[PDB]
Design a binder for this molecule. Structure first.
Ligand SMILES: Cc1nc2ccc(NC(=O)CCNC(=O)CCCc3ccc(CC(C(=O)O)C(=O)O)cc3)cc2s1
Ligand SMILES: Cc1nc2ccc(NC(=O)CCNC(=O)CCCc3ccc(CC(C(=O)O)C(=O)O)cc3)cc2s1
Ligand SMILES: Cc1nc2ccc(NC(=O)CCNC(=O)CCCc3ccc(CC(C(=O)O)C(=O)O)cc3)cc2s1
Ligand SMILES: Cc1nc2ccc(NC(=O)CCNC(=O)CCCc3ccc(CC(C(=O)O)C(=O)O)cc3)cc2s1
Lengths: 330, 329, 329, 330
């Protein structure tokens, strides 16, 4: 055999991966997550799962052909969740997505039914993984993943407002002529229409914009900064309208969260977690607050001091989600 | 204004220094784009297409990921003025082959498109290299060269960089070695007439043909020729499963973009003019190993081919030359 | 020749596009060099020093790692012709402080050395950005500005970029949060008179001073003032233990190089002329938050300092102008 | 406390790192290894060990102060090996180094005695690690570390000729005007004076340079390519003469090996391993041959086809190392 003439084998060695990530769903979002994760060298094995077998195999092969240009030496796929065994991180991107001009909340029942199949299968093969929920409505679906999985809450994370905040900082940076990395500001609450821009924390170099413009973000704002948050809220709708769907920004947002988890960075991200206790919330509502994210998922939450107006808006985001969540059966 | 309360401007207009343009925002163009962005190759990225909503949507979606990137300006337009001062312009526009359709069947459609795109590209970017991805890529690199009037060093086809990456992937799987450490060259047409250079296939400098002189022949007990067949068939297998290909070509193009933008002078199997070599007397473009840097292809490696390998490469050349005789400018 | 048997040359090429020069191959210069190489910032790296053996050895040692890098030309000489066409020239030459010695004590030794260095740099790269790292950095940025004849945007001092990084590290350790998510600014002189801006210290936009009004004062139960004291004493503590500092300043300088080379327009606390701010009427350079990109410092952020914070800064200011006004060169 | 006003803890912090690397020795080589590893984002924790307390703490602090610019969230150090617990990779750079005009082989008794202390303490706290030997003479010290550790031979790796080959490829590329990445050539055998340039394997794009110039590497060679190997052999001595020591190139070479190990790449490197049973060698000689390197260390060896002269030179390298190795007591 040519291989045995060339190479003396010293070790048989089932190569059990140490930094494996699974992406469930090979729609545009799943594949954007996949490419971003591959190009950030976060995983030693990447597994893809879907129910459409030709599509799944083709995406896998397409990725495999780029292996020379990557540093992820095993890429695998199957409809069978055994392919997902030993994942540190499992990212769920499966489900229906909103039409142009349709709320994410309109997807809830269809994606809950899907999660009733997906989540136990994931947990069966990787009982100690962190789950990262991307599917919409992400705050509710993170609650549902949590209830279905039986995992402790630190290990069930929603991608939440990591992207809304990235969008906010992009638009802020465009207005100011400063890189988004140096423009700070937080969008919290629902990943959707009722998200809350925290005007009180918006700053560059520690200089609060609200101290320079007391009306910042209100109707009375002469520069109408509220329209920056409106743009954040409308972003998905606009991109859907233009291109049909969104993919690249969310892929990058998800890869950013995967990086904090896989590298134990303990950076702070606005992501969906259980907020029972804070700002007077008594039910098991999940929504985005700033969380410390690392190898054990969400270990700590930053307590933002919200103005009465910001707290009011966040109470209302919380109310909207509990309004849908409450009726659920699964 | 708030901006002026916060920031004192101290300085008056700069050219981007490391700009890349991608023409075409299909799956291939956008895969090139995301790969280039994630490799930090450019200080400005421009996208061009003819479908305006789709173009704006793609631009916006990349823009929204700016926090996670180091490319501070992403722009798009149907108008080529947006591409001004590019160092590299990557062309991914055109028709794509159906299942069972040869890339060579795309030539008249993509030539007509190139007659528009190429003069508009070169107009605004005096320092650019032209990297052609659209198919048939060897023929279209010749077409881009003829229309642009650029010198040959500046007009590069993505060629067999991807075919060779595929070959090395498949070889790696057979041998249990990373593709980076598995060496082997697929030359000629990026298509059905490509040529696997068995004489050069090696790990750690050890020629696999020296261990098995039957390597890659019908007598080969391990049928290594099927690795090359899988290379030839790979686009059509992926097309059949997924409907198109994107990720691997995107990564292959970003690999070439890296060598050009960083002046690396790595060797790649990419489409260039081969008149003068292997008894080829006409202006045929096809893949040979080329040294690629900031001025494009500055040098060509003269691969010593066996008589059979050389005849296969000349057959690829003849096929491509035949199609070139169909071209009308 | 073997080269010509293997390779056919297409053209005789021109000048690098992303060249960086490091002046000084002491521990700081080489830490800047390796960090720059590992961040893929330059297509050419040039080293200059006056100790020829040491210079050649450092260059060779870097060259020997080229396989693992993507910087295709690494060069060195005592002669500044080697620095031609640099985009960025980083000056790390000069005396460094012994244990217990003040940075201000270095001033006449390093001013003398800059009288030789700066005109030679400007002769070969008249369009470069100058990044001054030698100490006292605020005064030596002034000196390089005056000698070079460059506009102020192109003469930048590393300033408090490192001090702020140290602050964010110490803050991170106290809070159990990555420094990337812990925000706070140390401004003014890169030395004992630096100013911690307590009003701006925050995580996720939540002001630490709002939670603890006495933050940074003597009444502070947790003595956060000690964090700024540790920042001030950092270089001295490290010098006492190891004899010098290198890694952190090297990384800090590479971070600034990254913003400049990739035109990122991030905000950094670096030395620039602050005449017109905080009741400063003279040509003083010290650290404020600056937007840094391909033309150097284009913009300054106006930090709203408390009366005590501003007093501390106008004191940092006065300390530096005392010396600066009387320099002869 | 302020931390508790700011942050609500949700999870009891049982932190155990997943991708920890330890560097023993904070000399120039050790610290070059460290900064290179930090800048390649290979580890979630970096531990340093030495016996000089102040120098150790200074180096650790200096790295820590750059944390903002890195993605390695915990950097620690101690004279005590408890600090190294749970390492996946431990890199040994400790020991005497050669003076100008002294052979690496002359360091053997000093560094064997040091290894008798270091190696048992490393394996005490990191039972899962790969051991990467950098100290000299590296080939013999890999053998020694193997015998002392009780590890299987796949997990005890010498940095070997990974550097000599990188030097060879740099000089080659300089001559041809090609990036070293595309200039292929192998230097095998001792990391030292008896190393063997494999001229028969030297190629660009699969084109043998020896087929073009049959005299390649011999004295009759008009272009004197043998001088390239001579420069490889003399590299350390030349740089030591000029600069006092070497650091950057070995640091990058070690980080290259660490990347293949930590990311399970299965790339081929010329590194120190047992060669008993190849080329007629009958004793437990360790030297560099091309090896496949991954998460379990060296799993496979490539059998290079050498010319009779190349093979004789390799056999001679083995004989030289055995001549020193057979006298060792530990
Ligand atoms: C039993 C079963 N098992 C499986 C297994 C796999 C699959 N496979 C799929 O379902 C793949 C197709 N589905 C998608 O890709 C949905 C993507 C959702 C999405 C879209 C956009 C954004 C970001 C966006 C916004 O928030 O709207 C913004 O803000 O930009 C976030 C999330 C189906 C089943 S059924
Ligand atoms: C006047 C005008 N100006 C414009 C400007 C823009 C556009 N825009 C588009 O045309 C966008 C849509 N077109 C595509 O995306 C074509 C991609 C071609 C492709 C596909 C696959 C592979 C690799 C593959 C293989 O070789 O088959 C393998 O080997 O995997 C290579 C190349 C149209 C016009 S019209
Ligand atoms: C006519 C002539 N031309 C030349 C050309 C070259 C040279 N070459 C050298 O002088 C090389 C040796 N010199 C050094 O390396 C000086 C390092 C300065 C330093 C040290 C520490 C920190 C950071 C530190 C802090 O800021 O204090 C902290 O905060 O950690 C910053 C800066 C001499 C001459 S003479
Ligand atoms: C009981 C004890 N425990 C400890 C623990 C720590 C320490 N600490 C130190 O010993 C620190 C100082 N020692 C060094 O740093 C030695 C570096 C060796 C080196 C130098 C150069 C090259 C590459 C080079 C070439 O091969 O020569 C080329 O080819 O370029 C390779 C290897 C002492 C003790 S004692």
């Amino acid at each position: 055999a040519l291989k045995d003439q060339l190479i003396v084998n010293l070790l048989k060695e089932e190569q059990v991966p140490q930094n494996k990530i699974t992406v469930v769903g090979v729609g545009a979002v799943g594949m954007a997550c996949a490419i971003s994760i591959l190009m950030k060298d976060l995983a030693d094995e990447l597994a893809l799962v879907d129910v459409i077998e030709d599509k799944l195999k083709g995406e896998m092969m397409d990725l495999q052909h780029g292996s020379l240009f990557l540093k992820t030496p095993k890429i695998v796929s199957s409809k069978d969740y055994s392919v997902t065994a030993n994942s540190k991180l499992v990212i769920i991107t499966a489900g229906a997505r909103q039409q142009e001009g349709e709320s994410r909340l309109n997807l809830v029942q269809r994606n809950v039914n899907i999660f009733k199949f997906i989540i136990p299968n994931v947990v069966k093969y990787s009982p100690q993984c962190k789950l990262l929920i991307v599917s919409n409505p992400v705050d509710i679906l993170t609650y549902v993943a949590w209830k279905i999985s039986g995992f402790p809450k630190n290990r069930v994370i929603g991608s939440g407002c990591n992207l809304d905040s990235a969008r906010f900082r992009y638009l802020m940076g465009e207005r100011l002529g400063v890189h988004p990395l140096s423009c700070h500001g937080w969008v919290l609450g629902e990943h959707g229409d009722s998200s809350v821009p925290v005007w009180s924390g918006v700053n560059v170099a520690g200089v609060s914009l609200k101290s320079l413009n007391p009306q910042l973000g209100t109707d009375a704002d002469k520069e109408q900064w509220k329209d920056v948050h409106k743009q954040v809220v409308d972003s998905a709708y606009e991109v859907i309208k233009l291109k049909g769907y969104t993919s690249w920004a969310i892929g990058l947002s998800v890869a950013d969260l995967a990086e904090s988890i896989m590298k134990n960075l303990r950076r702070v991200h606005p992501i969906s977690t259980m907020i029972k206790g804070l700002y007077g919330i008594k039910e098991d509502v999940f929504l985005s607050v700033p969380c410390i994210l690392g190898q054990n998922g969400i270990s700590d939450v930053v307590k933002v001091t919200l103005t009465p107006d910001e707290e009011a808006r966040l109470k209302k985001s919380a109310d909207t989600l509990w309004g849908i969540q409450k009726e659920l059966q699964f």
